[PDB]
Short mmCIF file of C-alpha atoms in Angstrom, two decimals:
data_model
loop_
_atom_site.label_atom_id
_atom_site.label_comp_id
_atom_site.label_asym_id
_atom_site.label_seq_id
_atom_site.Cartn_x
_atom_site.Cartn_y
_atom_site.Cartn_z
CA UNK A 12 104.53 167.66 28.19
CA UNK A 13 107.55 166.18 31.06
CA UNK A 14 105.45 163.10 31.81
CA UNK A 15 109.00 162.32 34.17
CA UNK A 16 106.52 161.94 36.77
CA UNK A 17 103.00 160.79 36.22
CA UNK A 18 100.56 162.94 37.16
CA UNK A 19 97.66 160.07 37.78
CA UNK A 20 100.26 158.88 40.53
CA UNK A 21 100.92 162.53 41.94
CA UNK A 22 97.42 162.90 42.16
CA UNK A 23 96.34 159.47 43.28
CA UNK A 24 99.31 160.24 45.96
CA UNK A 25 98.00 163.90 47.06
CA UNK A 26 94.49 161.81 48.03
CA UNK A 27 95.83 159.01 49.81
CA UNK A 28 98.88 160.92 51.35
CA UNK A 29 96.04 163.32 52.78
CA UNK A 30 92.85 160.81 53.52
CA UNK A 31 95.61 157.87 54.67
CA UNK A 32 97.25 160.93 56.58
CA UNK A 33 93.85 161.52 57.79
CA UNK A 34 93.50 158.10 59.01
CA UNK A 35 96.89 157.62 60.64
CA UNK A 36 96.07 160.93 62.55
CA UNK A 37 92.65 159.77 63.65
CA UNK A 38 94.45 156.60 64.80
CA UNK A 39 96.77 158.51 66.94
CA UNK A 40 94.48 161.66 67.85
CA UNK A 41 92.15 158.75 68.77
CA UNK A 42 94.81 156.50 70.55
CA UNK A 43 96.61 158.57 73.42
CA UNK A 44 99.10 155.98 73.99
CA UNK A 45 98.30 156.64 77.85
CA UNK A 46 94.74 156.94 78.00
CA UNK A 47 95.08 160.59 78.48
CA UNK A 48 98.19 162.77 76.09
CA UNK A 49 99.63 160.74 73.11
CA UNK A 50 103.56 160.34 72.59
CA UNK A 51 104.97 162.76 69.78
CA UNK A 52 107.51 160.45 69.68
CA UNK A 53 104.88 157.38 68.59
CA UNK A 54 105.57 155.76 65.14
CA UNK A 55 102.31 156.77 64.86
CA UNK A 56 103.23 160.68 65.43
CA UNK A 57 106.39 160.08 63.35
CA UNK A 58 104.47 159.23 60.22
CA UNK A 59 102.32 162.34 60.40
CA UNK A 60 105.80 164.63 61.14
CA UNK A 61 106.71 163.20 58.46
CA UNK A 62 103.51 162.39 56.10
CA UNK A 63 103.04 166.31 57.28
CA UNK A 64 106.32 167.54 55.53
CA UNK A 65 106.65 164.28 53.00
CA UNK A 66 103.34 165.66 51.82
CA UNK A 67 104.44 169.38 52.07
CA UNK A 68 107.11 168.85 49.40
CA UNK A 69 105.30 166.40 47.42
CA UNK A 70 102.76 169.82 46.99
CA UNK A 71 105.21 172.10 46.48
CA UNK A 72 106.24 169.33 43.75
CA UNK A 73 102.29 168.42 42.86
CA UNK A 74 102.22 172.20 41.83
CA UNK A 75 105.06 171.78 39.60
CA UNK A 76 103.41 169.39 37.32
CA UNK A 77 100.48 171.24 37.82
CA UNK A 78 99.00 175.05 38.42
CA UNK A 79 95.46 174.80 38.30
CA UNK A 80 95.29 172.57 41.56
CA UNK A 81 96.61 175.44 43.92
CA UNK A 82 93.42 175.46 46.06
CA UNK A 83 93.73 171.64 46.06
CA UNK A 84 97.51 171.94 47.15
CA UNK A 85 96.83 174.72 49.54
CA UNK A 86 93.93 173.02 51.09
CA UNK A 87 96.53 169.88 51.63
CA UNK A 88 99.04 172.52 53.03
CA UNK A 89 96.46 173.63 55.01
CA UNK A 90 95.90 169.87 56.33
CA UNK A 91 99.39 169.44 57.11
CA UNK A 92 100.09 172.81 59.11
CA UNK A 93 97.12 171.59 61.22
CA UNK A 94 98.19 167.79 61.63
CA UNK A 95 101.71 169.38 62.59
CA UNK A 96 100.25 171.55 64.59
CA UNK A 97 98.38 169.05 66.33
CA UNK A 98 100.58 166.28 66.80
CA UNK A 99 102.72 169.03 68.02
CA UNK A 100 101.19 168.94 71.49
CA UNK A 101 101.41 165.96 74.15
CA UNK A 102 97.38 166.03 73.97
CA UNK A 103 95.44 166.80 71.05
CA UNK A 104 93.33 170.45 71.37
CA UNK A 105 89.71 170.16 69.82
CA UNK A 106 90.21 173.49 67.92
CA UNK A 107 93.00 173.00 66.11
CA UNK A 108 92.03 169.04 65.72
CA UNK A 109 88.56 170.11 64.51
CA UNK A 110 90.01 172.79 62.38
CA UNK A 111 92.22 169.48 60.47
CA UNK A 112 89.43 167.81 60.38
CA UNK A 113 86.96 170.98 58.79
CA UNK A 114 90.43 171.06 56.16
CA UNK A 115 90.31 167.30 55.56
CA UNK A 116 86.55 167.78 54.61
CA UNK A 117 87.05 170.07 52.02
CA UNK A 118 90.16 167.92 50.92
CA UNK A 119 88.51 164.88 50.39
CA UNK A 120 85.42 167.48 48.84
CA UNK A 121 88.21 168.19 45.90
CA UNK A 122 89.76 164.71 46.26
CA UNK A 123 85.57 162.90 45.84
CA UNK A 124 85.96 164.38 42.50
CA UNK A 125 86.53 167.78 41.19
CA UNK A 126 89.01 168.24 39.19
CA UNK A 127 90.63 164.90 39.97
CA UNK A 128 89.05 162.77 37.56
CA UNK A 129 89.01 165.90 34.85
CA UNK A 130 92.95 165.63 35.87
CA UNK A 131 93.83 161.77 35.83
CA UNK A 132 91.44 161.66 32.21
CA UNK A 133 92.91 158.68 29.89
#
């Protein structure tokens, strides 16, 4: 059992990198820094390019420690392609937005308590 990383913190970090993620993005998706587009460039926008990919790895890595959460990972992935994808325009389209947002549901579905708590046990 590598218990180099522990897996209670990877998980713990796969919800709140996603559902903070989640909140950061409403924050900006919410907040066009002009009333009408928002700045990729925002610190706002930063930390979701890089939350997006920070997270991205940190799957990749999650999955490491851990095979059985590939649908949770994948759903994450999922989350992040759209919140790049997203944040990747000046204003934010209500497809793709909606589409994060349909992802983030089922995210925080697995995340409410799945396999989560079966996974962080003792």
């Amino acid at each position: 059992m590598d218990e180099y990383s522990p897996k209670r913190h990877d998980v713990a970090q796969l919800k709140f990198l996603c559902e903070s993620l989640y909140d950061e993005g409403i924050a900006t998706l919410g907040d066009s820094h002009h009333g009408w587009v928002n700045d990729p460039t925002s610190a706002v926008n930063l930390q979701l390019n890089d939350l997006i990919e920070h997270i991205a790895s940190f799957v990749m890595s999650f999955k490491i420690k851990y095979p059985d959460d590939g649908d949770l990972s994948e759903l994450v992935e999922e989350y992040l392609d759209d919140t790049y994808t997203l944040f990747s325009s000046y204003g934010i389209n209500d497809p793709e937005l909606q589409r994060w947002q349909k992802t983030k549901e089922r995210l925080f579905r697995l995340f409410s308590g799945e396999y989560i708590s079966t996974l962080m046990k003792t």
